A paper describes a structure:
WbbB, a lipopolysaccharide O-antigen synthesis enzyme from Raoultella terrigena, contains an N-terminal glycosyltransferase domain with a highly modified architecture that adds a terminal β-Kdo (3-deoxy-d-manno-oct-2-ulosonic acid) residue to the O-antigen saccharide, with retention of stereochemistry. WbbB’s two C-terminal GT domains produce a polymer with a [4)-α-Rhap-(1→3)-β-GlcpNAc-(1→] repeat unit, while the N-terminal domain of the protein contains a GT99 retaining β-Kdo transferase, referred to here as WbbBGT99. Kdo addition blocks further polymerization while creating the epitope recognized by the carbohydrate-binding module of the cognate ABC transporter, allowing export prior to ligation to lipid A-core in the periplasm. The evidence presented above strongly argues that WbbBGT99 is a retaining glycosyltransferase that uses a double-displacement mechanism analogous to that used by retaining glycoside hydrolases.
We generated a WbbBGT99-D232C variant; this protein was completely labelled when expressed in BL21(DE3), but even protein expressed in ClearColiTM exhibited ~35% labelling suggesting that additional unidentified enzyme(s) with appreciable arabinose-5-phosphate isomerase activity remains active in this strain. No detectable product was found in the activity assay, implying that Cys232 cannot transfer Kdo to the acceptor. We next determined the structure of both the WbbBGT99-D232N (at 1.9 Å) and WbbBGT99-D232C (at 1.95 Å) variants as Kdo adducts. The WbbBGT99-D232C-Kdo adduct was generated by crystallizing a protein that had been spontaneously modified by the CMP-β-Kdo present during expression in E. coli BL21(DE3). In this structure, Kdo is at full occupancy, has ADPs similar to those of surrounding residues, and electron density quality comparable to that of fully buried amino acids. For both variants, clear additional density was present that could readily be modelled as an α-Kdo with an unambiguous linkage to the anomeric carbon. The Asn- and Cys- Kdo adduct structures refine with α-Kdo in a very similar position, with only small shifts (0.29 Å r.m.s.d. for Kdo compared to 0.24 Å for the protein), with the largest shifts in the anomeric carbon (0.6 Å) and carboxylate residue. The carboxylate group interacts with Arg12, as well as Ser233; in the WbbBGT99-D232N–Kdo structure, the hydrogen bond is to Ser233 N, while a ~30° rotation of the carboxylate group reorients this oxygen in the WbbBGT99-D232C–Kdo structure to instead hydrogen bond with the Ser233 Oγ. The most striking feature of the adduct structure is the dramatic reorganization of the Kdo group relative to the CMP-β-Kdo complex, with the C1 carboxylate moved furthest away from the leaving group phosphate, the exocyclic O8 group closest, and the anomeric carbon shifted 6.1 Å from the leaving group phosphate oxygen.
Numbering used by the authors:
A (entry chain A), B (entry chain A): 1 to 216, 219 to 382, 390 to 406
Write the structure that this text describes.
Amino acid sequence: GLAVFLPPYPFRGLKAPYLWMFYKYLHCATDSILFITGEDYLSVTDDEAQRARWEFDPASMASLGYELPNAQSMACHEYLTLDNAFYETLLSRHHHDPIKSFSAFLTERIPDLETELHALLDSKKGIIDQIDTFISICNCPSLEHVARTLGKEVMHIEIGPLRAPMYRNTAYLDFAGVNGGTEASARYEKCQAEFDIKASLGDLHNYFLEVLPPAETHSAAGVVLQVEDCSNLIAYNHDFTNISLLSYVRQRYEKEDILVRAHPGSLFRLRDDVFTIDDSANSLAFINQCNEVFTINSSVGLEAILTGKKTTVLGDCSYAFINELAGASATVNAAAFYLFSYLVPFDLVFNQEYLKFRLGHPEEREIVGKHIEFYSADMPHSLSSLINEAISLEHHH
Amino acid sequence: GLAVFLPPYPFRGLKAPYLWMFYKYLHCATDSILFITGEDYLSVTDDEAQRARWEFDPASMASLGYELPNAQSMACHEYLTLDNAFYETLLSRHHHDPIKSFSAFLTERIPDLETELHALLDSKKGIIDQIDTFISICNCPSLEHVARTLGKEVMHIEIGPLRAPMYRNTAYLDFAGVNGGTEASARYEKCQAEFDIKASLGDLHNYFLEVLPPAETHSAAGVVLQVEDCSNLIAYNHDFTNISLLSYVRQRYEKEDILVRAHPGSLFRLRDDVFTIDDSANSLAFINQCNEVFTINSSVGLEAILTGKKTTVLGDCSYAFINELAGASATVNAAAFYLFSYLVPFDLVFNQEYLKFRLGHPEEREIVGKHIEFYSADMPHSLSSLINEAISLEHHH
Ligand SMILES: Nc1ccn([C@@H]2O[C@H](COP(=O)(O)O)[C@@H](O)[C@H]2O)c(=O)n1
Ligand SMILES: Nc1ccn([C@@H]2O[C@H](COP(=O)(O)O)[C@@H](O)[C@H]2O)c(=O)n1
Ligand SMILES: [Cl-]
Ligand SMILES: [Cl-]
Ligand code: NA
Ligand code: NA
């Protein structure tokens, strides 16, 4: 079975920070799952004091494809809970800075956490032997160390850079790390000779686009801002922040030529009278107004690349290696590998059969084949032939 | 004469970042000054492309007490300019991150900068021997190293934490460092036995208040946000940021009990629907609505302390040592020393006679006496008697 690690520590002030993934795995479960989480995930449902959370909004639930769980849905699974006493102790060891504590959680081993994880996993006979893989929504060396000791893999699974409603939902699934420490570039370098894609970058974009593209004033430079306390601005940012990204761009452009888009999820917006502030209804319309795009490691950087815009990527991220290739054909081949083999159809990373498939480490050809089968499900070979044919069927339907 | 160091490097994207201090020293000058700066400070006046800067707004000029300089005003002084080629090289050595480059400038020696400074100071005979002291608006180990070699002191001078129109204008003057690395606590520990002030914290506040206090709904916790790229959020913050300060407070209070005030100077404001956002006309009205106040190292933390509010200070700053005393009488005595001896009447830090006075390192009693003489100028002893009498004359006039 699966062992799904969803830490309860409220590093950013919100209880059950990864609730949506708990609900998604519960809703998709065709077998019993082991959940390694906190009591907050179990007690938020009934609380009826948190019920205004976005995870309970039927529009969010529809976009992500889940329904709230019932006593019946939850009874099928096993739950291990981590205590908060360790969280308070963790904060005490990082000058009571919750964000620095989160950084340590993401990037360093925490031996006291490893001990509690080991204890929980040993709390009942047979729990460990029935674990086929761990799953984590973020990097966590503590868990990854525990997994080595036990001989288990760790799939790092997260929502991907292309999301509904603009795009088909995608997910990350990476055995080495998610956002930071990823294996996308390594996987591509191993199979790059198998990719001969007869499509442009914009064609790859159009395959994943689920809406009519927005209507076509240009700004020399577009600046993508991110959520200030998302893990990849804490740990994988190469020290850059929204404010230093802005300063970076100002070294190269006068303010009249800068267009800044705040992240709709950020707690902060921009003051109305310094820069030109983007007000597009989505990030695609924003980047279409820009001649070149600057980002730390936002998902929007991938959108910029795929629409052919000169993009600067200052942080670490899964897609950066696409942008570091010289040839136009090489960039397309890398993008095609990224989109059809590295990224996973979102629902499949919650499907136990697909997860067991990936746990066998199959060939890139088989992975691409299973993804295209899912993407083609409602439609009326080698690897390139599969991708080329898939693009062509969208070409005329 | 004075040697006034005003670096031209646009770490935050703005040319001549310390223009106001250039104009203030020029306007107040009763003798020839040596300016160590950049061409941008000399070429911004006529540029008439920057003229919308706040340094040119007559209301700002009045608040800070200066007028724009003329060809005549500037002719009296000597100017050494630093080249930009070093700035571009500096950026190249810190991953092209201007904010990290600014951090290095503030906190580390930069040997190539020391060489250019030495070269400029040697560029004309007799320049060095006529320097009585350096002045810098910020910490700069490069300059401070040069000064040691040459046998010169470095006065660190900056606008203070109490400013017009709410308060009498104050300034910092610190031989060791401004904001970070300050000598306020050290100076107080040396003279603490001389302070026996028969006044409350609120009385000290009222002495510096220049307006009728705002009219008296309370929030359990007020959160002071700062300018995201001010030096003391870059270098003296103990790694805290606005966003981690907010997370810190959320570990202790639910959002309904938090009141957040953005810095009017910040480029960012808060989204309207997460926290309760303060909209007070000034920071005093904001802290009056709060039962306890949280800050990294804002000037507003001093206001909170002086109005008697429980204050948490997470970064390094000049006033923190006041907040770390236990006794109510000890806190008043430290505050009185801070306000009357450490802080300087703003205009005096631009007055060459006062600067030569301080360069003699006089006793705390003489310093307090000169400050009270300035504050008392428009009014119709030992150290405590001077401060007590000064407070009492405000008591009835
Ligand atoms: N400045 C920004 C950053 C992100 N976003 C939206 O958020 C999604 C995820 O972006 P991050 O990877 O930046 O969190 C993007 O696909 C886009 O839809 C935006 O619309 N404007
Ligand atoms: N959150 C904040 C921070 C500062 N301020 C104003 O800015 C001045 C300087 O504050 P900093 O030291 O935070 O830059 C304060 O005296 C206050 O007048 C404010 O009004 N609200
Ligand atoms: Cl799909
Ligand atoms: Cl005064
Ligand atoms: Na499509
Ligand atoms: Na007064």
